[PDB]
Structure formats: structure tokens, C-alpha cells
Amino acid sequence: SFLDTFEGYFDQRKKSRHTMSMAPDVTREEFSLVSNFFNENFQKRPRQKLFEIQKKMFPQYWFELTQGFSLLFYGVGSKRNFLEEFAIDYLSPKIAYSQLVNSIPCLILNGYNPSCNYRDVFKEITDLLVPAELTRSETKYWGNHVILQIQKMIDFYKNQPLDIKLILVVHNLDGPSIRKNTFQTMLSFLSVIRQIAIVASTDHIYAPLLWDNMKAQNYNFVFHDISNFEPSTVESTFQDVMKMGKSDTSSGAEGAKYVLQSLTVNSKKMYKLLIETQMQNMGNLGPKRGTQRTGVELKLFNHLCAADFIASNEIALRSMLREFIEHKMANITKNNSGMEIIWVPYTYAELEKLLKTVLNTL
């Protein structure tokens, strides 16, 4: 009878053996070409018209922010470009002018990346804002240092003048590695600080399920509707589309493949050496993660690279490896005995696919 009610759902709650193999074959290159052609040619002018219409709402957003209201953007389409345009070009220069010189720093946090880690985000926030250290007594018995430091920051900032010193853009607040309770609790405690501004964007329908009473209070959101039907080119980059994204959606290997496709020939060669050494170690030791016990030693890697004329010494290797570390394609830690270890956190099957799809073509 009905289709858009609970009665309609109950009515709707009660076969062709054709897969996509018989469907027209799709190649990734032509897929990207056609999708790109459609993205910036389909509804360009209406999209710019809507963007200009909703840009005039920016002073209202700034006024809401300057009164202790963390701001959220929800709606269909990609708000990444819109929210970045709002925060970087309009919010920061205007707040810098109003506070008085230098612009207010803008920490933009890509939440669609499954490799986003809360430790690194707080490392950036404490490198930029530079809060006071917590005393030994305040550390408590093995308590989480991030949350305790944030609570100390709240205590310190309850008395400072109410002028914004940072805006923390949060793209795709309901993404794969940003929806987990730990990072959400961090953001919940962080947003109470008046001196920082939390502008975020959500996409999932059940996104408000992530916030309890306390977290909703600490966020203190003011929901705003933005819907411009943008095609979300950047969001889809980190996950595969040929397999529709149904498999390894949160793996993060597709983003690594995209970034490594055209990075540098020598970086690709040394990454191939590291990957091959990791597979050899896995074979020496079922699909398992590339943990530390299977990784490659830093001295061993330097010797192997020197044998292949990739990196002559420690300095160049470390300098060019910091780029991979910052993008989470690899990790460097220290073993229990003190030996340095470099490893790739990708699954052995994912590592083999990466080796045989981009690395092996040279």
C-alpha cells in the first residue's frame, strides 16, 4: 500500500542469475576518465550557483562558532571542498582580523582516510597549541595520557581569554577510523575548549548514533544542512571501485596504491625491496597482518639498499622514509632488544596484490 512509512516497511518486508561478469567489462583507467568527465561537466553551473547562494551564510556560521558552538555540516554530496573553502579562505583570515599579525592555524583532519590515528592527531595538536605538561601526580596509575592532558587543557583554558587560537576542521566525522569511540571521546573532550573551533562534516544516515548524552553535550553541536550533490572524487580515492568497495573497505591499501602510483622511481624501488623482504619474513614465519615481529631491521634495510644503490647512507634513507611514515604506508618502531624495525601494516594478500599490480610493472 505505502512505501515511506513503518506500515510501508512492513509491507515491503516479506531472481536473475546474472552477475557483473556478463555486464560490460570496465577498466580502471577508462572508469576514472569517464567519471572525471562527468563530474566537472554534468551540473557545473547549478553547483556553482548553489555554492554562491550558500556562501552568504558564512557570517552566520562564524557568529555561531564565536559563541562556543561547535558546528556540523550534514547532507548529501561531498562537503569536503565546501567546508575547506569555508575554513581556510573565509574563517581564518576573518578571525585573524577580528582578534586584532598572522592567520590562525587551521588543522584540517581528513576523516575519510582509514589510516587516521588519534595519537598522531593529538601529537599535531600538542605540537601546534603547545599546552603545559602534566605533572607526575596528574598522570594517575597508568591512565590514558591523551584524555588526562585534554582535561588539564580544559582546566587551563577555562581562564584564558576567549579568543580562538586554532580551528580543527574534521572532514567526514563519521568515517571508518574516526567513528571509533576512542577518537570520538578525544574530540568530545577537545571541543569543550572554547579557544579551538570544531567544524565537522557527516555523511552516514545513522551518524548521530555515535554520540551519547555526554558526548552530544560536549560537542554542543549546531547542525547545518549542506546538500550540493558533489561527486566526492577525493573520498572515493582511498577505496576500490571495481569491486564496489565491498571488500577491504577499511584496509587503506587502495590509498597507498594511489599515492605510490606516481611518487618516485627510487622510492618505488626501495618500497619494492621492503615489501619483498617483508614477504620473505612472512614466509619464513593464513593471511596475517604485517606486525613488528615480521618487519625488517633498519640496519638490514640500509645494507640491502646500499647493495642496490638506492640510499647510500642513513641520512638519505631516513629523510626519504619520513615521507612514507607520515602517510602511514610504513611504520618504524623499536624491538624489545632495542633493534629498530620498519614494517608495512598491510595484509599479506594486500601486500602481494600491491606488488603484482603496480610494483611489478616497474
Binding site: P59, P93, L107, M214, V222, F223, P231
Partner: protein
């Protein structure tokens, strides 16, 4: 590198050197940018002073709440208990948010150590005990200015170590979240610390739901042990209605007769207050502040709240206000009907004080009373107590007699208040997605200039067009049939003509000559749209080894 491929990367924008004196203000010139800058500056300063005036009283009320609850719980903690030192007294804080600094009074002969435990910091009994003993040792050593192992024997040796009596007070921050097996084991462990005759223990359970769950979960022996001394204390911001009334009265005084509260606005306040109890006062403050700032933002006449600027009326102001419905139904004309302060607030305050001093009635909502008075059925709210029958004669109130209240009022007729604080999230998404016509503006002035002036009008955006079929689809959907229907709904020749419209690219035209170019560009669009739906949660996929079927998750409305 590509910054979009990064994560959590800071950016320092290069602010322009161009600047002015006082162009930097969030408030914008209303009435098509015709108002002068002085009016905007005056609006800004009056908003700031009024916001400070309101929030000062709000902070005073909040601090009063915290001080009163702390004093009451501290008084109940000791209460001059003559009970024999064979059990520990327990205080169940009914429905208490775990945000309070329980202060322990300093005693000359007894240390008073507050040990706070949380579900995150209590995986099991041994860690409960180690954290508690570490906190005890640290606090005792800090007060008192070799080492001892972290176990219960530290309590045994406390009199010998520090030459003083002990009083440990356990504050369980979230007693509902802790799995009650380890909490019960920890309580039984603490029971073993009563053989010393120099240590007294006090337990505080920050219960949120009720004691029914505590009775159900805890062992019977533990409940029997607790029952020897328990004190059910009901601490909450929503209990007694004596604290929301103070904040609402503070707001009423900070708007005074200068502003008026619409009946529907207070009705919305009451409705949203009734749907939340754990955190009520903060939500009320947020709603009031948002309404106030919105009213000063999108209303041009807020600059004329005080009489001193009444003379600042200009031709545009009078021209706009001429279309006021109250004026049609009915400078110097406005002021003689503006400076008349509204007696509703004073009458409400007098009635509340009169009933709360000697009428011996306290359990009432000042918001509900104000809403009822605004409607005009004050008898229907004063007759429930059945005690002011002989006092109703002097409590009668003259009906509403006011004019030009549209320009000075707090209301939500454009729907911003409801859609900015409690929006219908999923409902808004579906409303925007089903009817995309009202979301994307339709333009025809520059369709000649654009390259796709004939295809934009005829067809619909891919994602919404797919959502149309998805809503018109069945519970379980084959991907093949869904794509077939989507392509059939797709015009054929127009897509090819659009492809031919670009001569710059060469791969596109190379693929254009292929007979099934349309059949594959439609497929590419379908995969993009289904991926977007999966990301947004509209659709879900069954076992990936089959991947031939999908299930609809969200239904419209």
C-alpha cells in the same frame, strides 16, 4: 605530494595585507545591505552585554547547585553515625552525572582519602585494588609530606606507617558501566578490611538508572552486607524543578519587557525539555542562547530595543514595518506603545514567589506556568493543587493586551530553531534526496553559455535518480536488474551527444565510437552511485563471496 591524500595536516593560510578599521564583524548589514555600520555595532554591543548578563546569573545558579549538592552529600557522609565499626556506609546517588568534586573534610586524627574509580580504569579486581592502594599511598604521603607493595595490607599497616587513623571514601564514577562481577568481588575484598578497628570505609555508588538493576545484578550476600548502612540520595539537575525555574527566571529578567516570548517558542522549549532528563539544564541554556543570538542576527529591528535609538528610525525602517499585520489590524506612535513594559513577567514572578513562600507548593515548572499564562488558561494550571481556592481571587491576570510584538519577539516560524539544534537528520536527508528540484536551483539565464544547456534540464542528478528507483525498489535487490532499470530510465542519445560535445579529450571520443559506450558509461555511473549509497548507509551488501544481492537499509520518512 597530494595534501588531500594526507591526514591531520596543519595549514597556515596567508592572510591578505588589505584590511580596514571595523569591517571585521560577523553581523551583516540587513535590508539588502542598507543599514548603517553604527546600527550593526550597537546591535553587537547590546548582544554582548545581554549575553554576559544572562550567563553571569546562569553561572551563579550552576555554582549554587554544585555547592548545595556537595554540602548535602558531605553532611550525609558523616551525619554523626553511632553505628558500630563492623560495616561501611553506602550512598547511592540516584541519577547523578559523574561530574562532581566530592570534598572530604579534614580531620586532625584521621586522613580522609577520596579514591575515585571509573569503568575504564577498572578492568578487574586486582587493578581496582592496585589503583586504590596507589591513590591512598600518594594522597597519604602528600598530606604527611622505603616503599610498600600495592595490596590491602597497606591498609593493615597504615596506623603503624603514618601514626593516624584512616577514612577511605570510594567514589565509583559510573557504577552502571562496570561489569558487576568485578565490582561485587571488589566489595567482598573490601569487606576483609574490617579486622583492624582503625580503618573506616565509605562507598559511593553513582547510579544512573535505579536500584532495581543494582538489586538484580549484585549477589544477595553483597546486598545484605550493603544494607547495614545505605542512604538513597536523589541528586540530579532535573529533580524538584527548583533549578530550571531559576534559569528561566534569569532569562525572563535579562529580556525583561524589552523582549517577549512567543507561545510556540516556550511550547517547543517545554517539548524538548520533556524528552531529555539526564542533561536538561545545559540543553535549556543552549536552546535559549541560540534563540537569542538568532533573533539578534536575522531581525533588523533589534537595534531599536532601547528607547534611546527609537529616534533613529529611517524611511526604510518605516516602509518595511508598514506591512506589519498588527499595524494594519490596529515614530511617536511606536514609542507610546513600546515603552509600556509587559506586566506578564512581573505577574509570573509574583505568582511563583507567592506560591513558593507560604502556599507550601514547590513541585512546579515555571516554564509550564509561563506557557499556560501565555495561552491564558492559568486557572487550569492553578486548580491542580486544590489549595489556592481562596487565593485565586487576587491571582487573576488581565488578558494579553499588547501591540507591535511581532518585531520584538522570540519565535521559530522559519524553522531554523528546530532544524539547527534538533534537526530531523535522516528525514532531512530523504527530503533533500527525493525532491532534488528544491535543493539544486534551476537556472536558464546562462544555459546558452554553458556546454550542457540541453541535458541538465531533461535529466536528474545520478545519486538522487538512483535513490528514486531504490525507494521504488524491493527489500532485496539484484544488482543486475537494478542497473538494468537505472539504464532504462537513462536517456540514450543525449548521453552520446554529451560525450561528443568535448573535442579536447581524445580517449573519450575514441571510446565514443564503440557501440556500447552508453551501456558502459551508464554502468560506471551506477557503480559510482551505489558506492555513494554504501558510504552513506542507504544500501548494504550481503555475503561478499556472492555480491549479487543488496538490502535496503533506510526507508524514506
Amino acid at each position: 605530494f597530494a595534501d588531500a591524500q594526507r591526514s591531520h595536516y596543519t595549514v597556515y593560510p596567508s592572510l591578505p595585507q588589505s584590511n580596514k578599521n571595523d569591517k571585521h564583524i560577523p553581523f551583516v548589514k540587513l535590508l539588502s545591505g542598507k543599514e548603517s555600520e553604527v546600527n550593526v555595532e550597537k546591535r553587537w554591543e547590546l548582544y554582548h552585554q545581554l549575553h554576559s548578563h544572562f550567563h553571569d546569573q546562569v553561572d551563579h545558579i550552576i555554582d549554587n547547585i554544585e555547592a548545595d549538592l556537595k554540602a548535602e552529600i558531605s553532611d550525609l557522609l558523616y551525619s554523626e553515625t553511632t553505628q558500630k565499626r563492623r560495616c561501611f556506609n553506602t550512598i547511592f546517588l540516584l541519577g547523578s552525572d559523574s561530574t562532581t568534586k566530592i570534598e572530604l573534610k579534614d580531620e586532625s586524627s584521621r586522613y580522609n582519602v577520596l579514591i575515585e574509580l571509573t569503568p575504564k580504569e577498572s578492568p578487574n579486581v586486582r587493578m581496582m585494588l592496585r589503583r586504590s592502594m596507589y591513590k591512598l599511598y600518594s594522597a597519604a604521603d602528600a598530606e604527611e609530606h622505603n616503599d610498600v607493595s600495592y595490596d590491602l595490607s597497606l591498609v593493615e599497616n597504615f596506623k603503624r606507617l603514618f601514626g593516624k587513623d584512616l577514612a577511605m571514601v570510594f567514589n565509583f564514577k559510573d557504577v552502571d558501566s562496570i561489569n558487576f562481577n568485578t565490582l561485587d568481588n571488589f566489595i567482598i575484598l573490601l569487606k576483609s578490611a574490617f579486622k583492624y578497628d582503625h580503618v573506616k570505609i565509605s562507598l559511593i555508588f553513582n547510579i544512573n538508572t535505579n536500584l532495581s538493576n543494582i538489586e538484580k545484578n549484585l549477589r544477595q550476600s553483597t546486598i545484605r552486607l550493603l544494607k547495614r548502612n545505605y542512604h538513597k540520595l536523589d541528586v540530579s539537575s532535573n529533580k524538584g524543578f527548583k533549578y530550571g525555574n531559576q534559569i528561566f527566571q534569569s532569562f525572563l529578567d535579562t529580556v525583561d519587557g524589552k523582549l517577549n516570548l512567543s507561545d510556540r517558542f516556550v511550547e517547543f522549549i517545554l517539548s524538548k525539555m520533556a524528552n531529555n532528563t539526564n542533561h536538561n539544564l545545559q540543553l535549556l541554556t543552549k536552546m535559549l542562547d541560540y534563540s537569542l543570538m538568532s533573533y539578534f542576527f536575522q531581525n533588523a529591528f533589534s537595534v531599536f530595543i532601547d528607547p534611546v535609538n527609537v529616534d533613529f528610525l529611517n524611511d526604510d525602517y518605516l516602509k518595511i514595518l508598514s506591512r506589519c499585520p498588527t499595524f494594519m489590524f490596529f515614530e511617536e506612535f511606536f514609542v507610546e506603545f513600546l515603552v509600556r513594559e509587559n506586566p506578564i513577567n512581573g505577574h509570573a514572578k509574583f505568582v511563583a514567589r507567592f506560591l513558593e513562600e507560604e502556599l507550601n507548593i514547590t513541585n512546579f515548572n515555571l516554564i509550564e506556568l509561563y506557557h499556560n499564562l501565555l495561552i491564558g488558561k492559568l486557572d487550569s494550571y492553578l486548580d491542580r493543587w486544590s489549595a489556592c481556592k481562596e487565593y485565586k481571587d487576587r491571582l487573576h491576570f488581565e488578558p494579553i493586551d499588547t501591540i507591535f510584538q511581532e518585531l520584538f519577539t522570540l519565535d521559530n516560524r522559519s524553522g531554523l530553531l528546530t532544524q539547527s539544534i534538533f534537526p530531523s537528520y535522516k528525514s532531512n536527508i530523504e527530503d533533500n534526496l527525493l525532491s532534488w528540484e528544491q535543493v539544486l536551483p534551476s537556472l536558464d539565464k546562462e544555459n546558452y553559455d554553458t556546454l550542457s544547456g540541453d541535458l541538465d534540464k531533461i535529466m536528474a542528478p545520478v545519486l538522487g535518480q538512483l535513490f528514486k528507483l531504490y525507494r521504488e525498489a524491493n527489500m532485496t535487490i539484484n544488482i543486475y536488474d537494478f542497473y538494468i532499470a537505472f539504464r532504462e530510465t537513462l536517456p540514450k542519445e543525449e548521453i552520446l551527444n554529451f560525450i561528443r560535445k568535448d573535442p579536447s579529450n581524445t580517449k573519450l571520443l575514441e571510446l565514443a565510437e564503440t557501440p556500447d559506450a552508453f551501456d558502459k558509461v551508464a554502468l560506471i555511473l551506477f557503480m559510482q552511485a551505489i558506492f555513494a549509497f554504501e558510504n552513506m548507509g542507504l544500501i548494504k551488501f550481503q555475503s561478499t563471496k556472492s555480491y549479487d544481492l543488496v538490502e535496503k537499509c533506510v526507508w524514506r520518512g
